[PDB]
Design a protein around this ligand. Structure first.
Ligand SMILES: *C(=O)[C@H](C[C@@H]1CCNC1=O)NC(=O)[C@H](CC(C)C)NC(=O)c1cccc2cccnc12
Ligand SMILES: *C(=O)[C@H](C[C@@H]1CCNC1=O)NC(=O)[C@H](CC(C)C)NC(=O)c1cccc2cccnc12
Lengths: 306, 306
């Protein structure tokens, strides 16, 4: 028993991280086959970041202006291109540690592990969620750029996130591996509105099912509700509306615990309307929404990788 | 900026995990050089676990009764010995992925990353602390045994924990890599008292310094206190007493933030006496004690490994 905010084992991603240097700028790159992927703002100076014309900047750069280092050894860059907000550096050697991999663009609410790196070396690994407003609440310092978020499935790594930017409000924004930002954000040192964040209702419900599985169930109430009635309460407390899809996805946890989804919704309703009243759920004094139903099933059944 | 419960990159430990089978029992082993380390209760049946004579049980076993599997390949066991509560299986092949490593016995309050494994394959990685009462609040299912906790320093892995047991109260207990349990616990299916847990005061203080570094500082009060006066309040709320050692260890965070330790103690005092009043600190509605001062400095300065 027990429930932790568990990250994927990082080993497969560790072997892909490299350092990319251009001018005075250094950040992390992801080396897969004979391509290195990194944020295109590697080509910028602090001055350029105010208002970069990335086309104009990249034109000044040649293959040899990109130093890629994997440990001690230099990779030779024989080609470069800009796809959206990422730079693709073709190198002459294939990464011998390349895992089976996909690029995926995940939906709001989904979760992944971040491998936080500096100078192409990992510092740590943590689990986080793509917020409804397409930001993440990560842990990123100067030089963290190029760090990636990912999911593993048996032996296949699914890369979903590359870190590009901390907003003025201290929250984090980035792209998929095709370099398309999550959300409205641009790679420019400018004030940028993230917009209203919302709580990921289905994830909270998943986490409540986790709590019941692990014996924590004081919050189970005598009430039920409807999807509409619940949603009225959801909008008030800045929760995402609950669909039959979300209800369907919770089916397994409902089947394992014998608690109907709408009964758990009623319990959740009461927690929102009355607060948690000084008590805790799975060591938390607030409603956690960083666990997808899939995360709960993974953790509580001990699914393995490699 | 931002602050996460970050685990170490697990890659170096992934390459050490193996499956150990004896009779019908299977659990995780740690393969370092030509030795595999695993819990000695691998030799038990469900019946034996009530009251095992480990000496008597092990005597019935020979080298060939231990199947060690690293992926597809079998390791050949050419020797076995019992050190305290761990079994050491000498194998004929050295692990080619052996990292630079130490065995350390950590103190209460210190932190480490757990790599949760099943059948010698990792499921996930999370950060936790050795509770003052020598338990850990982990995430462990049947078959999780042999899973290890560790710290990394540049390229050296320091193994501090091997998982052996979930207590009836759903908390977790284990040994160092020399097989000596943390705390009073024995490897027997019996009711076992963990004793009163306490909050790791120095870690809470560290985390408050982290909070100030990351702009969260509403909790900063107008008051100061003494070490004695603070400690009086500490004992009341089940906090560990604060020593000059702990004050000394917080020095760096005090120097970075310009907040004297005893002023932060006063702030902490007020949070304990008045509660958090519906507000949050670094996304938490309670006082986190799983971050050592070293963890805070690591995270907030982006220290790397490999
Ligand atoms: C990447 O290495 C670095 C990571 C930042 C630095 C502080 N924490 C992080 O997560 N990114 C940048 O250098 C980045 C460049 C963007 C504009 C492409 N700049 C920012 O992340 C950044 C920092 C502070 C304030 C603002 C405001 C607007 C845009 N970007 C900002
Ligand atoms: C290891 O694979 C397994 C992990 C346990 C199983 C449930 N979650 C875990 O963390 N350990 C055991 O099989 C273990 C054997 C001990 C006695 C050496 N038994 C327990 O961990 C266990 C489970 C429930 C209740 C009790 C009560 C007393 C002792 N051990 C218990």
């Amino acid at each position: 028993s027990g429930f932790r905010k568990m990250a994927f084992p990082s080993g497969k991603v560790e072997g892909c991280m490299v350092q990319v240097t251009c001018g005075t700028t250094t950040l992390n790159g992801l080396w897969l086959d004979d391509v290195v992927y990194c944020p295109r703002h590697v080509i910028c100076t602090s001055e350029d970041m105010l208002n970069p014309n990335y086309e104009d900047l990249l034109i000044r750069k040649s293959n040899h202006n990109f130093l890629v280092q994997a440990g001690n050894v230099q990779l030779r860059v024989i080609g470069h291109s800009m796809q959206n907000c990422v730079l693709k550096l073709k190198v002459d050697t294939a990464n011998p540690k390349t895992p089976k991999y996909k690029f995926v663009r995940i939906q709001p609410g989904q979760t992944f592990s971040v491998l936080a790196c500096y100078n192409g070396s990992p510092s740590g690994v943590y689990q986080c969620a793509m917020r409804p407003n397409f930001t993440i609440k990560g842990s990123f310092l100067n030089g963290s750029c190029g760090s990636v978020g990912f999911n593993i499935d048996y032996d296949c790594v699914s890369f979903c996130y590359m870190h590009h930017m901390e907003l003025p409000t201290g929250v984090h924004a980035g792209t998929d591996l095709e370099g398309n930002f999550y959300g409205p954000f641009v790679d420019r040192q400018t004030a940028q509105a993230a917009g209203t964040d919302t709580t990921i209702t289905v994830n909270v419900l998943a986490w409540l099912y986790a709590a019941v599985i692990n014996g924590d169930r004081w919050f189970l109430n005598r009430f039920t509700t409807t999807l509409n009635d619940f949603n009225l309460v959801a909008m008030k407390y800045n929760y995402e509306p609950l669909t039959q899809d979300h209800v369907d996805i919770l089916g397994p946890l409902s089947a394992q615990t014998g608690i109907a989804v709408l009964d758990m919704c009623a319990s959740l309703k009461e927690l929102l309307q009355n607060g948690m009243n000084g008590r805790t759920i799975l060591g938390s004094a607030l409603l956690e929404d960083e666990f997808t139903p899939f995360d709960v099933v993974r953790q509580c059944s001990g699914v393995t990788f490699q």
